[PDB]
Scaffold this active site. Structure first.
Site, mmCIF file in Angstrom:
data_model
loop_
_atom_site.group_PDB
_atom_site.id
_atom_site.type_symbol
_atom_site.label_atom_id
_atom_site.label_comp_id
_atom_site.label_asym_id
_atom_site.label_seq_id
_atom_site.Cartn_x
_atom_site.Cartn_y
_atom_site.Cartn_z
ATOM 1 N N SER A 12 2.779 -2.996 11.431
ATOM 2 C CA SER A 12 4.090 -2.556 10.982
ATOM 3 C C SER A 12 4.916 -3.762 10.576
ATOM 4 O O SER A 12 5.302 -4.558 11.425
ATOM 5 C CB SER A 12 4.805 -1.812 12.099
ATOM 6 O OG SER A 12 6.203 -1.892 11.916
ATOM 7 N N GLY A 67 -1.454 3.862 15.898
ATOM 8 C CA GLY A 67 -1.663 5.218 16.374
ATOM 9 C C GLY A 67 -0.907 5.596 17.632
ATOM 10 O O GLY A 67 -0.919 6.755 18.033
ATOM 11 N N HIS A 126 -9.826 0.895 4.622
ATOM 12 C CA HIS A 126 -8.576 1.167 5.313
ATOM 13 C C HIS A 126 -8.816 2.083 6.508
ATOM 14 O O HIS A 126 -9.645 2.998 6.440
ATOM 15 C CB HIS A 126 -7.568 1.821 4.370
ATOM 16 C CG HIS A 126 -6.159 1.744 4.861
ATOM 17 N ND1 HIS A 126 -5.614 2.687 5.705
ATOM 18 C CD2 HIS A 126 -5.196 0.815 4.660
ATOM 19 C CE1 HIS A 126 -4.375 2.340 6.004
ATOM 20 N NE2 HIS A 126 -4.097 1.209 5.381
ATOM 21 N N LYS A 144 0.057 4.143 -0.391
ATOM 22 C CA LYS A 144 -0.656 5.265 0.201
ATOM 23 C C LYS A 144 -0.449 6.538 -0.617
ATOM 24 O O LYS A 144 -0.272 6.476 -1.834
ATOM 25 C CB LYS A 144 -0.206 5.467 1.657
ATOM 26 C CG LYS A 144 -0.404 4.219 2.544
ATOM 27 C CD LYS A 144 -0.419 4.551 4.030
ATOM 28 C CE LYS A 144 -0.510 3.281 4.874
ATOM 29 N NZ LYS A 144 -0.083 3.491 6.295
ATOM 30 N N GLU A 203 -7.270 4.517 7.637
ATOM 31 C CA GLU A 203 -7.097 5.936 7.344
ATOM 32 C C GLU A 203 -8.362 6.575 6.747
ATOM 33 O O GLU A 203 -8.661 7.747 7.000
ATOM 34 C CB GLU A 203 -5.893 6.130 6.418
ATOM 35 C CG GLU A 203 -4.578 6.107 7.186
ATOM 36 C CD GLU A 203 -3.416 5.601 6.359
ATOM 37 O OE1 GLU A 203 -3.496 5.681 5.118
ATOM 38 O OE2 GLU A 203 -2.421 5.126 6.951
ATOM 39 N N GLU A 214 -5.855 -4.611 10.831
ATOM 40 C CA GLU A 214 -5.063 -3.421 11.116
ATOM 41 C C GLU A 214 -5.035 -3.131 12.618
ATOM 42 O O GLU A 214 -6.064 -2.806 13.209
ATOM 43 C CB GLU A 214 -5.657 -2.209 10.400
ATOM 44 C CG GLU A 214 -5.336 -2.093 8.916
ATOM 45 C CD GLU A 214 -5.773 -0.756 8.354
ATOM 46 O OE1 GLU A 214 -6.938 -0.642 7.927
ATOM 47 O OE2 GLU A 214 -4.957 0.188 8.349
ATOM 48 N N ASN A 246 0.859 -1.176 0.000
ATOM 49 C CA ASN A 246 0.000 0.000 0.000
ATOM 50 C C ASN A 246 0.901 1.234 0.000
ATOM 51 O O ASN A 246 1.400 1.662 1.047
ATOM 52 C CB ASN A 246 -0.898 0.014 1.230
ATOM 53 C CG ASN A 246 -1.870 1.182 1.230
ATOM 54 O OD1 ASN A 246 -1.993 1.904 0.240
ATOM 55 N ND2 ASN A 246 -2.572 1.368 2.343
#
Ligand SMILES: CCCCCC
Ligand SMILES: CCCCCC
Ligand SMILES: CCCCCC
Lengths: 248, 249
Positions: free
Chosen positions: B212, B172, B94, B12, B96, B166, B10
């Protein structure tokens, strides 16, 4: 009257087989008078448009963008657009304001960033049917514009273009009567004059949008404060050529 | 007896010709001899250039988002527009988009239902925030996100559905999720699917880890029973992404 602008907003539409001929017609149309043309394809179609669109009077714009690159899945930034050689962008379209939570402040942020990045910006302002009926048109559009101006320096205005598109006239076939467009455009320029001077207000381009067609463009351009159009539906047809001709 | 793994990139909101071309060349120069399905998801603007240069046979190009229909939706791109261009893979839901763009469960489910109906392979993202995890609602949250799309899908649709967990809680807050923490959630997800949709469905469903991931921890993660691959972030814009793909061997 400053140099007119004819902008095409293809919105969420298009296909290779549909765009090739359309771009062809655009490349054969040779306008002689001073006019700046702008086409705004979807992000996926900017590459092919920038490859085939050869008319020197035309420029390519993005339909939107975000202020910075990074962890923003699905979005495209001003920096990515700039590296690709695109220098025009449409911001604050009512559709983005109503469906994707773009508040006056969010829009002002995007415009300020775009201007700094060196972009030519088309900022959209406009009131809804209920806002007009309630007699709040003036309050609404001025508040929308004011939020944008608050973040701009005097020099940024040379890269700023205003697009007035009454929501009640988008994809509805209910274009504003020429007198109706004139009135709001008049209001917009006066606020800018009283705030930034005569020079800037005089050079400022205020475009009209909302059910514009070759049958009503000429009449709308007759008004003294209308400097062109932001066209949606009719922009995906060879009809766009005639609309550009109406800016003579 | 895990199903075919997936290594997804991804990109992004990142990229430029100068950065992407050498990256594609690297990916084109790599040969993977194990059964793996690779995916690269560039910004809409870069999809055309990527499709013209990408040659690795194990790679498919995906979109990072899409809307259900074409029309008066300034700034967006629809499933049909992407399909006409030859794209058949899309990433939806996603974190985000769920956090900065208000995409609710209902909005994401309609997007997935329609993408499936149009013939797309879909990677649906699910995940809980730190607040939700701390309040002990991890299961309630991810299963609710999953139940939402499940209700809209027919049985046959799941063959083109891929799930990406995720760990927003870790993302975060800058913390790093251990392989066990990841597997704890993948297991619950497969459990729900195996008892709600089918034993056949659960055995073939790919659940990718979208936390990650780097070449350092990639192998340790894939060794967990219910992790069938990754949805890679920043490490996918570097040559090390090749090593992450190899970690699924
Ligand atoms: C990036 C501007 C969009 C705002 C979404 C709430
Ligand atoms: C910087 C883009 C994120 C959207 C915030 C509303
Ligand atoms: C708070 C612990 C998370 C485990 C969820 C199954």
């Amino acid at each position: 009257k400053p140099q007119p602008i004819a902008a095409a907003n293809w919105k969420c539409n298009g296909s290779e087989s549909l765009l090739v001929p359309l771009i062809e017609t655009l490349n054969a149309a040779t306008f002689d008078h001073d006019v700046q043309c702008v086409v705004a394809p979807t992000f996926l179609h900017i590459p092919m448009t920038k490859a085939r669109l050869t008319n020197p009077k035309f420029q390519i714009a993005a339909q939107n963008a975000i202020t910075r690159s990074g962890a923003f899945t699905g979005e495209v930034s001003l920096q990515i657009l700039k590296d690709y050689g695109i220098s025009w962008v449409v911001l604050g379209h009512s559709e983005r304001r109503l469906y994707y939570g773009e508040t006056n402040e969010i829009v002002a942020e995007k415009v300020a960033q775009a201007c700094a990045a060196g972009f030519h910006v088309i900022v959209c302002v406009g009131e809804t049917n209920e806002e007009r009926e309630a007699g709040r048109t003036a309050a609404v559009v001025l508040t929308q514009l004011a939020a944008v101006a608050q973040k701009l320096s005097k020099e940024a205005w040379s890269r700023v273009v205003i697009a007035y598109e009454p929501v009640w006239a988008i994809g509805t076939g209910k274009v504003a009567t020429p007198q109706q467009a004139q009135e709001v455009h008049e209001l917009l320029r006066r606020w800018v004059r009283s705030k930034l001077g005569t020079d800037i207000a005089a050079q400022l381009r205020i475009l009209y949008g909302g059910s514009v067609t070759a049958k009503n463009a000429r009449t709308l351009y007759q008004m003294r404060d209308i400097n062109g159009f932001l066209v949606g539906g009719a922009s995906l047809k060879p009809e766009f050529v005639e609309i550009i001709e109406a800016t003579k």
